[PDB]
Amino acid sequence: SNTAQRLERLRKERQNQIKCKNIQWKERNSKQS
Amino acid sequence: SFHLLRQQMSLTEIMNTGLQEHTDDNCLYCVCIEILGFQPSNQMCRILLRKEVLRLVINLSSSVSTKCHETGLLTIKEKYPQTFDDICLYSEVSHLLSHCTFRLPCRRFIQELFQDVQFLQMHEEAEAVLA
Amino acid sequence: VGSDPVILATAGYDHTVRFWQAHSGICTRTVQHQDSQVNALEVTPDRSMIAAAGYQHIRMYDLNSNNPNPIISYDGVNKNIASVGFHEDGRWMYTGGEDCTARIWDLRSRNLQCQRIFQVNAPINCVCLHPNQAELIVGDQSGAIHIWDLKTDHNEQLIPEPEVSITSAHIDPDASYMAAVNSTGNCYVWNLTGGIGDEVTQLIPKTKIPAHTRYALQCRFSPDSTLLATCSADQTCKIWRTSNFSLMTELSIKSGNPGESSRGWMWGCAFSGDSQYIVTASSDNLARLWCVETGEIKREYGGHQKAVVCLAFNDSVLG
Ligand SMILES: [Zn+2]
């Protein structure tokens, strides 16, 4: 159907969207050390 | 409620009964416990997914941001395809579609993620009481 | 493939970074870099991974394999990244951002929390690392050079002249001088710390060389610490000696025709292992290979479509 095609369409890019490693900058440090 | 706490957190962050308007008179399966004689349904990881699914339904009733809410429901059906397989959740969604008002393209989007379901609980109980 | 003794990489506004070799002008690999422009790129000491930083994200690319995608990416900052660098042992990565924050990133995927944040009142342009990997230099747009020491948490503030923004700063590997340039072309040189023991971080004004009437873009030393090349906006590069700071060799790319009118600036320069051939990347959509003695170029690379404002060139330690 309509949303059935979109559901499998979204999975196609999900395979290629897990090839990148993202590291965020958390506001934590060795302040007490 | 889960609606208020959701805006300050994330779906993955929290992970690191859920039906609100669920009484024993307006459910497809729960209403047959007494009149027919069905058995009680069986089952913290899955209880936080019901609220996330439900809250996106309410936010979809305003049509302010349809694309954002529709995108959120599609991801859940991919990462957790088995969450749309409980009759009680479908009863809760169907009940909400009656009181609230939804646009036709949005209303057809709902009740369509449930097309490929089996609902084995109703089939098992109906066969036993009928035989 | 980065399995070569010497590698060369250029990037710019073309949204693609080209990998070159000094032996021939052919392009080994083309990597894709979307919706951003590369400010400055440097290779890890392990010579197996390269870093490209621009506009709030530092995309990391592989060298051993052929992957045109940013396998590793960093986020969190809200402005551009002026420059990046790595520890000699590849333990931590220090990045300078336009958001007035000079921070250090950790390369270990564990809760080490080896990251430190330094705050300044003006956006910074260049970040330099002391050869002993114990001190660090931060230069902002206010002309004030902050000497940051890793052992302590206090940084000395030195400003030669206000109202002028500095662009680059570098320290020779042999730890003999310490030079920096500003937005007017003056190249200030200070004698670095002589206290190798406790890092007394004392500085004195050695000399001033009046040159580069236009904007000064980048100044860098050489591995043998006998040469000093400073870029400029007048399409000229001058190489300075460490004996008496005289003009050793003058390099220019001007065509001599008034109809061009500064067709492209000269952004970056790099030395080789033997400090004999230098690689320059100008904003004329091409890069050239020069020689410090004959003056005339050696090879030319013209595979880019847009201007290139950054280049990375490293080879074997022996030479
Ligand atoms: Zn029920």
Curated annotation (Swiss-Prot), chain A:
Span of the entire protein shown here: 84 to 116 of 522
Domain text: The CRIM domain forms a ubiquitin-like fold with a characteristic acidic loop, which recognizes and binds AGC protein kinase family members substrates.
Oligomeric form and interacting partners: Component of the mechanistic target of rapamycin complex 2 (mTORC2), consisting in two heterotretramers composed of MTOR, MLST8, RICTOR and MAPKAP1/SIN1. The mTORC2 core complex associates with PRR5/PROTOR1 and/or PRR5L/PROTOR2. Contrary to mTORC1, mTORC2 does not bind to and is not sensitive to FKBP12-rapamycin. Interacts with MAP3K2. Interacts with ATF2. Interacts with MAPK8. Interacts with GTP-bound HRAS and KRAS; inhibiting their activity. Interacts with IFNAR2.
PTM characteristics: Phosphorylated at Thr-3 by AKT1 or RPS6KB1 in the presence of growth factors; the effect of this phosphorylation is however unclear. According to two studies, phosphorylation at Thr-3 by AKT1 is part of a positive feedback loop that increases mTORC2 activation.
Tissues/organs with expression: Ubiquitously expressed, with highest levels in heart and skeletal muscle.
Subcellular location: Cell membrane; Endoplasmic reticulum membrane; Early endosome membrane; Late endosome membrane
Name of the molecule in the record: Target of rapamycin complex 2 subunit MAPKAP1
Domain of life: Eukaryota
Post-translational modification Phosphothreonine, affected residues: 3
Known function: Component of the mechanistic target of rapamycin complex 2 (mTORC2), which transduces signals from growth factors to pathways involved in proliferation, cytoskeletal organization, lipogenesis and anabolic output. In response to growth factors, mTORC2 phosphorylates and activates AGC protein kinase family members, including AKT (AKT1, AKT2 and AKT3), PKC (PRKCA, PRKCB and PRKCE) and SGK1. In contrast to mTORC1, mTORC2 is nutrient-insensitive.
Family of this protein: Belongs to the SIN1 family.
Gene name for this UniProt entry: MAPKAP1
Swiss-Prot record, chain B:
Parts forming coiled coils: none
Intracellular or extracellular location(s): Cell membrane; Endoplasmic reticulum membrane; Lysosome membrane
Domain of life: Eukaryota
Binding site for Zn(2+): 22, 27, 30, 88
Modifications after synthesis and translation: Phosphorylated by MTOR; when part of mTORC2.
Subunit structure: Component of the mechanistic target of rapamycin complex 2 (mTORC2), consisting in two heterotretramers composed of MTOR, MLST8, RICTOR and MAPKAP1/SIN1. The mTORC2 core complex associates with PRR5/PROTOR1 and/or PRR5L/PROTOR2. Contrary to mTORC1, mTORC2 does not bind to and is not sensitive to FKBP12-rapamycin. Binds directly to MTOR and PRR5 within the TORC2 complex; interaction with MTOR is enhanced by deubiquitination of RICTOR by USP9X. Interaction with MAPKAP1 is not enhanced by RICTOR deubiquitination by USP9X. Interacts with CCDC28B. Interacts with NBN. Interacts with SIK3.
Function: Component of the mechanistic target of rapamycin complex 2 (mTORC2), which transduces signals from growth factors to pathways involved in proliferation, cytoskeletal organization, lipogenesis and anabolic output. In response to growth factors, mTORC2 phosphorylates and activates AGC protein kinase family members, including AKT (AKT1, AKT2 and AKT3), PKC (PRKCA, PRKCB and PRKCE) and SGK1. In contrast to mTORC1, mTORC2 is nutrient-insensitive. Within the mTORC2 complex, RICTOR probably acts as a molecular adapter. RICTOR is responsible for the FKBP12-rapamycin-insensitivity of mTORC2.
Family: Belongs to the RICTOR family.
The protein, known as: Rapamycin-insensitive companion of mTOR
First and last residues shown, out of full length: 1479 to 1694 of 1708
UniProtKB/Swiss-Prot annotation, chain C:
Family: Belongs to the WD repeat LST8 family.
WD repeat boundaries on the chain: 1-30, 33-73, 76-115, 119-158, 161-200, 211-250, 261-302
One annotated GO molecular function: protein serine/threonine kinase activator activity
Protein name in the entry: Target of rapamycin complex subunit LST8
Cell compartments where the protein resides: Lysosome membrane; Cytoplasm
Post-translational modification: Phosphorylation at Thr-44 by CDK1 promotes ubiquitination by the SCF(FBXW7) complex, followed by degradation. Ubiquitination by the SCF(FBXW7) and SCF(FBXW11) complexes following phosphorylation at Thr-44 by CDK1, leads to its degradation by the proteasome. Ubiquitination at Lys-298 and Lys-306 by TRAF2 via 'Lys-63'-linked polyubiquitin chains inhibits formation of the mTORC2 complex, while promoting formation of the mTORC1 complex: ubiquitination disrupts the interaction between MLST8 and MAPKAP1/SIN1 to favor mTORC1 assembly. Deubiquitination at Lys-298 and Lys-306 by OTUD7B promotes MLST8 interaction with MAPKAP1/SIN1, facilitating mTORC2 assembly.
Subunit annotation: Part of the mechanistic target of rapamycin complex 1 (mTORC1) which contains MTOR, MLST8 and RPTOR. mTORC1 associates with AKT1S1/PRAS40, which inhibits its activity. mTORC1 binds to and is inhibited by FKBP12-rapamycin. Within mTORC1, interacts directly with MTOR and RPTOR. Component of the mechanistic target of rapamycin complex 2 (mTORC2), consisting in two heterotretramers composed of MTOR, MLST8, RICTOR and MAPKAP1/SIN1. Contrary to mTORC1, mTORC2 does not bind to and is not sensitive to FKBP12-rapamycin. mTORC1 and mTORC2 associate with DEPTOR, which regulates their activity.
Gene3D superfamilies to which the protein is assigned, alphabetical: YVTN repeat-like/Quinoprotein amine dehydrogenase
Residue ranges crossing the lipid bilayer per the database entry: none
